[PDB]
Amino acid sequence: QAVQEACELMNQGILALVSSIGCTSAGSLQSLADAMHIPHLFIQRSTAGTPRSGCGLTRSNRNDDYTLSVRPPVYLHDVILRVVTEYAWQKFIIFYDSEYDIRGIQEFLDKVSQQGMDVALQKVENNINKMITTLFDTMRIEELNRY
Amino acid sequence: IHIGAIFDESAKKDDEVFRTAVGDLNQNEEILQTEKITFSVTFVDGNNPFQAVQEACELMNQGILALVSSIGCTSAGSLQSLADAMHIPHLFIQRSTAGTPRSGCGLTRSNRNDDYTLSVRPPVYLHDVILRVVTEYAWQKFIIFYDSEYDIRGIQEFLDKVSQQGMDVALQKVENNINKMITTLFDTMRIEELNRYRDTLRRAILVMNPATAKSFITEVVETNLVAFDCHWIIINEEINDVDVQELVRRSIGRLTIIRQTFPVPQNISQRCFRGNHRISSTLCDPKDPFAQNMEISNLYIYDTVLLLANAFHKKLEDRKWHSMASLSCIRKNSKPWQGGRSMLETIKKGGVSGLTGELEFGENGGNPNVHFEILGTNYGEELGRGVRKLGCWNPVTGLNGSLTDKKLENNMRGVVLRVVTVLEEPFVMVSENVLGKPKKYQGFSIDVLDALSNYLGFNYEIYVAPDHKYGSPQEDGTWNGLVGELVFKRAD
Secondary structure (H helix, E strand, O other): OHHHHHHHHHHHOOOOEEEEEOHHHHHHHHHHHHHHOOOEEEEEOOHHHOOOOOOOOOOOOOOOOOEEEOOOOOOHHHHHHHHHHHOOOOEEEEEEEOOOOHHHHHHHHHHHHHHOOEEEEEEEOOOHHHHHHHHHHHOOHHHHHHO | OOEEEEEEOOOHHHHHHHHHHHHHHOOOOOOOOOOOOOEOOOOEOOOOHHHHHHHHHHHHHHOOOEEEEEOOHHHHHHHHHHHHHHOOOEEEOOOOHHHOOOOOOOOOOOOOOOOOEEEOOOOOOHHHHHHHHHHHHOOOEEEEEEEOOOOOOOOHHHHHHHHOOOOEEEEEEEOOOHHHHHHHHHHHOOHHHHHHHHHHOOEEEEEOOHHHHHHHHHHHHHHOOOOOOOEEEEEOOOOOHHHHHHHHHHOOOEEEEEEEOOOOOOOHHHOOEEOOEEOOHHHHOOOOOOHHHOOHHHHHHHHHHHHHHHHHHHHHHOOOOOOOOOOOOOOOOOOOOHHHHHHHHHHHHOOEEEOOEEEOOOOOOEOOOOOEEEEEEOOEOOOEOOEEEEEEEEOOOEEEEOOOOOOOOOOOOOOEEEEEEOOEOOOEEEEEEEOOEEEEEEOHHHHHHHHHHHHHOOEEEEEEOOOOOOOOEOOOOOEOHHHHHHHOOOOO
16 A cells, blocks of 8 residues: 555655555555656654664665665664673673564674573563462472572 | 566575576466566675665565565664555565574564565574473573574574473573684683582583584584583474484484474475466475475475465456556655555465475464474494484474383384293292183292283283193203293293
């Protein structure tokens, strides 16, 4: 539908196409600009305020890309890493909300692996009380104290 | 009858097996008796979703009962949201880079419509296998290595549950050039950091395509990052017996190899038929060396065309048959076809006993019928790099068997063993006889023998040594007495 509207905008005639949209459609509008060669100014958005991850979508290497990604590439991993590094941490748990495109942790974990720190990673459910009582259903005292 | 088929220039094996499946199914005696399956030949750059949409729209202009594709997730999603505008059924045979473990595409696709895409390969369920394997080994620390192609949204729920197990993890990107990666890790890390990395590699999980896994394992061996001082796990759907035996050749330490299995006739030679239904031995018999060189997407394509043939036959049997609509895209006449949704329903309620077993779809349109098989290394003096089936996993039963029985044991339950004894109070006494034969025994030695027989479950055949003496050597090399019966091996 976003591609169909962009094509109707091209039928109206435009110098460039803006979007403010999710990756799921952003890559299709990119493929449209890859066929139509109309510029595509892409602004990314995310649900529920969940942190942003680069779309990383499968797009051709054979041709120039008309996508102008206005929100920047993922820098967040070094921002995490500087804080994790300064406090002399050796063990931590990552948490993410149920909507997170968890791929934004990737190079952070790659750089912590070179430091070797102990990691854990977990979803936080939309019912946190149900999740924590699922801990009581799934952990012993020894598990809960290691947690 | 007409079907849309779309493939990447690298996915030609799927077109070739679509043609092979049409070649078999046009010879079927009972399914589509009056009809033939057909498609218009097409190839695209799988990384140009607009070209794929353009071809799918041209196929739906030609008119099709369903669309089939095997293509990258952005293209598959563009075909999905096209089917959301067209209501033509889309059947998606997922593939991944070199066979990297199959995370789903898992698009945020709008809930405003029923999902007209049916994923013929099942949702992600490897994660609970990895969880139950780690729960067997109880690893207090381990590492996950995933390739740059794997979407960690597959291991996501495995990580979540391991967190709910309170056990530590490590992770790193395996780059497309393992040689550059590992030489960088040697040349640039601190000495203690490299020791931590090697020690962390002693408990490790591979989540990468076979060619990349084979590279990582080989480079680890040539560099000797770790050796037999490790326990490793490898899991994928695509691990044929040749790739099993090559991973057993390349891998090191004690290894778990976890691979898909299917609801099919257990004996391989039976799998080529389902009564009057018949399949070519070029596909159905993975005892054929060529069939061992198939890719599993071949099987899912074949089962997809079988499914569509049976759905069309059911639509004929239902007398629901009607002439196809002609549809168009990005035009003010563009609207969906109700007959497309009717075929979607006929596929979703329909099903077939394919080479991947019974093929059907859940409420979300994923195939539910996942199963896994577990092999592993069993080193032994008869075997060297021995291998045996350690178990299986499915969500119905969890892990079948155990990964940790150590080895085969000489456990003696139900064995019959021949025993010799001699009298001495309170060590050994005899208290009943029949036909000149001792029959009942007691005393501390016999009490210990009774405890042994009770726990180990073997039955004894005690006799008193026939010369009753405690044994002494004869000069001819024979032995008498209690010892003699053992030296002669008359008693065990």
